[PDB]
């Protein structure tokens, strides 16, 4: 059986983001923040399954919501019909966002949310009789895996397989991530984005994460998004914030953008929204953007949509996730336990192979000098009983939001033990 | 007042897919082939929820499979780990496909499957040291809603929001769909695709559906895919068959391409694979294509992947779907009952307003002379208690594969009554 399982994987399964050339762990069961492999070895899962297990494994509220809705109605095509969970989820998600962010479109993944967002930005300007094709982004940003999503990024492995479908101006970090959390760095960042925005005709949108995930758990200086909000007002560009990773408590606020206290024009969301239990993603925008689509000549609406976008089970699970977050105070717990986590790890920056320790809420990153060190850190933490996420030179701790104080201490100890062996 | 509140929150907060900005039934529960709205009215659901409920609503085997896996492990990141459902599903899907199709990549939607398939096609040629950028498609084809997927289509509402990321040669239908089922139509289609393939440097791939869904339930003549197989074999282009709609029994074979009896180089799948119960999609290709990715200079593998691609609950549900399809013989049932459905509808072509009646298995279409007639037909059928899908001029019946002879007769009677009132 173990022979056969390894063999069917080797022969038939194509893994994402992996080389064709140690065996991978086979995970089989989880409970709370712990997960177990096929040999019975147990681990604290400090990568939250796929950076999205906001409520941990086998959460009874999420399980029951899924079961109830699956039995009733898994979905129905929302193009010419509706269902009750889509209405509830659309209302509830709008309710968590600033005034004016009221209109929610559902898709399956963060990449599809990016696809819809970029279409909405371009088409909005067409609808207004003033076409704009250009977007401004971070070079170190990651917005998904489809051609349009990858085109927004300047990360080397995101090189696209065609030619550019529209112009993008990708802003490089003006300092190393370790030095980005100062007032001096805010000035450099704001001015770099001002130059990018004013380089040629006004852009359709500026699209950024509030904390860069795949780009290395990069924490931005206070005021950066506020500076972008001002730039967008001056130029007309839509401010799009990608909350796919930061959304729903990850950083110790309901959304990453709330640390700066800005109101975006469009927000994308996925990951923690459904606890990872059903594929689900969403975007929310303004009534002005929405209503502009009455000018679309071909349909009189947005020419976008997926078969399972707005899946009823996904919507029902998301509502249960939001109930758990609110009932248990997971946003506040993430802030408080997050502070403990970061404080526990911070002294490891004294180690010669550790360049920086940085984070916000329940994302924390140990940046090593080389990827080789990062891989060795991750391997030793695994030996200590803790699963972490490697991202090039960065090692990231991204636990379920239901993590407790004892488990945070265990996480810190494992990372200390790993750094000692570097 | 509950229903009023529901309609109001939808109107205020929900952005529907593929819809005009400027009312809709609210479906609340289903069982087998029947669904009920919020007012209590019941219908035979002859659009299978979202053209994807292969096993109908509240199927106990699928419900149990979802419950069991959700409780164990909803997913884990497949980039550097594995889980047992992904290995099982990869093997099982490959086993249903012809010899040589062995390597399966998982994504959430048909649109993502197209994104991955086009990247694979382009990157495969780069890996070989002979870059090829061009694809050949049907202008009336539909492959999804993201920019790349829309670019493959020539349908007017799929106009993209940027410029072409690669060249596409889109073949127009040489005859109306009603005249496309003959040996003369085969000659015209084969010759048109030959001209497209030989127009300029050899293409990377030829990508087609085996029966055009969104293009109007268009049935292609016997031998068309065999002609494309020879053209791909002549020029080296990859033969990509889009089975997102036709896959898993819909046309009375396990795959739509099996009517012609060809071996594609890559097949995309979604819809019926998970019964609609969890968002799920897949693609399967050859070892020749797979192993070429060792030459990728940035990763040594395919630079693609989604957070929830290979979702364990989705995989476990797909395994249960395949068990139901096989145990119940739904492929052959769809062939036989589908032939009875088409034979029941066929005399309606005598009506002045009906220009064709066409189908294969459990997709059947009544083509009207104008969209207004099609809309009227759908509306009267709904009054008779049957839900059908409008696709421009085309009215489509796409029931769950578990439909029985009595329900087929109900379906035929509703459509007869509808056509009588045109
Ligand atoms: C900020 C951000 N945006 C978009 C995505 C893409 O989401 P998916 O993998 O669900 O397509 C990710 C995935 N890591 C992300 O971190
Ligand atoms: C043949 C075909 N390919 C791809 C897609 C796109 O799939 P999705 O809606 O799941 O993105 C569809 C959707 N109708 C389809 O019919
Ligand atoms: K709001
Ligand atoms: K095979
Ligand atoms: K006629």
Author numbering:
A (entry chain A): 16 to 36, 40 to 440
B (entry chain B): 15 to 36, 41 to 440
From the paper:
Conversion to pseudouridine aldehyde via alcohol oxidation by PumI (SapB in S. albus DSM 40763) and subsequent amine formation to 5′-aminopseudouridine by PumG (SapH in S. albus DSM 40763) are the likely sequential biosynthetic steps. The pyridoxal phosphate (PLP)-dependent SapH catalyzes transamination, resulting in 5′-aminopseudouridine with a preference for arginine, methionine, or phenylalanine as cosubstrates as amino group donors.
The structure of SapH was determined to a 1.55 Å resolution by X-ray crystallography in space group P212121 using molecular replacement. The asymmetric unit of the crystals contains a tightly packed dimer, and each polypeptide chain shows the fold characteristic for PLP enzymes of the fold type I, subclass II. The overall fold and the mode of dimerization seen in SapH is essentially identical to what is observed in the fold-type I aminotransferase family, for instance, in the related 7,8 diamino pelargonic acid synthase23 and 8-amino-7-oxononaoate aminotransferase24. The dimer observed in the SapH crystals most likely represents the biologically active form of the enzyme as the cofactor binding site, and the active-site pocket is built up by residues from both chains constituting the dimer. The binding site of the PLP cofactor is located close to the dimer interface, with residues from both subunits involved in cofactor–protein interactions. The aromatic ring system of PLP is sandwiched between the hydrophobic side chains of Tyr160 and Val262. The phenolic oxygen atom of PLP forms a hydrogen bond to the side chain of Asn23, and the ring nitrogen is hydrogen-bonded to the side chain of Asp260. Extending from the bound pyridoxamine 5′-phosphate (PMP) to the bulk solution, a pocket is formed that represents the active-site cavity formed by residues from both subunits and lined with hydrophobic and polar residues that might be involved in substrate binding and catalysis. At the opening of this cleft is a flexible disordered loop region (residues 35–43) that could act as a flap and close the active site once the substrate is bound.
